[PDB]
Amino acid sequence: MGVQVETISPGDGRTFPKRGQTCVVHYTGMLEDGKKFDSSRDRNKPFKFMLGKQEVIRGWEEGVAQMSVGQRAKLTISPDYAYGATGHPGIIPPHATLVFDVELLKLE
Amino acid sequence: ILWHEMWHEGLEEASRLYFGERNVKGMFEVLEPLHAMMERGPQTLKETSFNQAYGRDLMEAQEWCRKYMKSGNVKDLLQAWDLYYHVFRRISK
Ligand SMILES: CO[C@H]1C[C@@H]2CC[C@@H](C)[C@@](O)(O2)C(=O)C(=O)N2CCCC[C@H]2C(=O)O[C@H]([C@H](C)C[C@@H]2CC[C@@H](O)[C@H](OC)C2)CC(=O)[C@H](C)/C=C(\C)[C@@H](O)[C@@H](OC)C(=O)[C@H](C)C[C@H](C)/C=C/C=C/C=C/1C
Ligand SMILES: [Cl-]
Ligand SMILES: [Cl-]
Ligand SMILES: [Cl-]
Ligand SMILES: [Cl-]
Ligand SMILES: [Zn+2]
Ligand SMILES: [Zn+2]
Ligand SMILES: [Zn+2]
Ligand SMILES: [Zn+2]
Ligand SMILES: [Zn+2]
Ligand SMILES: [Zn+2]
Ligand SMILES: [Zn+2]
Ligand SMILES: [Zn+2]
């Protein structure tokens, strides 16, 4: 639908993010063609965020919530679950399907 | 009112205007007064303490904003928000 999750390597299949829990992830963001626009791995600093706060796009909110600790997954996010018709001028084109390589390192 | 709370509220609102509503002018409207407040210099010990802690980071974020205003290159604006995000996390209790 809006976000498809395909496992690259498995987690414990038991430790899923709760409410008020901080997800710690490494991500690589690419356009559908496969052109990289961002990576936390380029900065050697994991990205931290809290689920259910609308801090991140809907695809991450619903995608990362399905992942268990240790899991590396590919998220294919349709425009309506990403930056939609508007996109982000000079970053994300209009109507862009985004592919994120996401690794859920731990929860805090 | 404490400089860290004014910067917390301003950076949060500015990020909402730019990333939420694709409104760079609105973002700049929120940031300019806070940068001006810094430029007037610290008055209290807590304001002096804040300026010493995060003065450098906030100055480099403004520099990237000025570079963006000339270039029109969003990459320069994302560099500024990388520093603003860094400051936001450090200052936020
Ligand atoms: C410099 O680089 C940017 C990130 C870039 C922007 C461009 C995109 C291609 C991208 O490269 O990230 C990217 O990889 C991406 O698409 N991301 C980032 C990784 C998570 C998934 C996705 C995303 O949702 O980003 C986010 C997306 C771009 C915008 C948001 C999408 C959800 C929507 O509900 C929000 O409405 C407001 C806006 C960016 C973020 O993850 C950052 C952390 C969070 C926010 C800005 C908002 O949650 C904001 O709301 C007030 C906050 O609470 C913040 C913490 C307040 C403080 C002061 C501001 C911090 C700002 C940090 C900015 C950073 C590091
Ligand atoms: Cl960490
Ligand atoms: Cl925890
Ligand atoms: Cl808050
Ligand atoms: Cl705070
Ligand atoms: Zn947060
Ligand atoms: Zn914890
Ligand atoms: Zn940590
Ligand atoms: Zn303070
Ligand atoms: Zn706040
Ligand atoms: Zn710093
Ligand atoms: Zn500089
Ligand atoms: Zn930082």
b/e per residue A2-24 (b: at least 16 CB within 10 A): bbebeeeeebeeebbbeeeeebb
The residue ranges of every structural domain in chain B are 1-93
Evaluate the CA torsion angle B27, B30, B32, B34 in order and state its sign.
negative
Tokens for A31? 């356009």
Tokens 């949060």 belong to which residue? B12
Q: Give yes or no for residue B16 CB within 6 A of ligand 1.
A: yes
Is-contact A22 A46, C-beta < 8 A? no
Measured distance CA(A8)–CA(A74) in Å, rounded: 7
Backbone angles phi, psi at A107, to 5 degrees: -120, 145
Query: Of A76, A47, A90, which is closest to residue B85 (Cα–Cα)?
Result: A47
List B9's β-bridge partners, or say none: none
Q: How far apart are CA B63 and CA A76, in angstroms?
A: 36
Does residue A37 carry a catalytic annotation?
A: yes
Spatial separation of the C-alpha atoms in residues A66 and A68, rounded to whole Å? 7
| DSSP secondary structure letter of residue B15 | H
Binding-site residues on chain A for chain B (CB distance < 8 A): 86, 88-91
Q: Which two tokens stand for residue A79?
A: 């425009």
Decide whether any atom of ligand 1 lies within 6 Å of the B11 Cβ: yes
Reported resolution, Å: 2.2
Three-class secondary structure of residue A72 per DSSP: strand
CB atoms within 10 A of CB A59: 23
d(CA B23, CA B16): 9
H/E element holding A24? strand A22-31
Domain ranges of chain A: 1-108
Could you tell me if the CB of A32 is within 6 A of ligand 1? no
Strands A47-50 and A22-31, sheet pairing? antiparallel
Q: What is the rounded radius of gyration, in angstroms, for the C-alpha atoms of chain A? A: 13
Q: Is B43 exposed, middle or buried (0-12, 13-18, 19+ CB in 10 A)?
A: exposed
d(CA A67, CA A17): 8
**List A16, A47, A57, A81, catalytic entry:** A57
Cβ contacts below 8 Å, chain A against chain B, sum to 10
Nearest atom in ligand 1 to the alpha carbon of residue A29 is 14
Determined by X-ray
Give phi and psi for A32, each to the nearest 5: -55, -40
Helices (H), chain A: 58-64
Q: Is A8 among the residues known to form the active site?
A: no
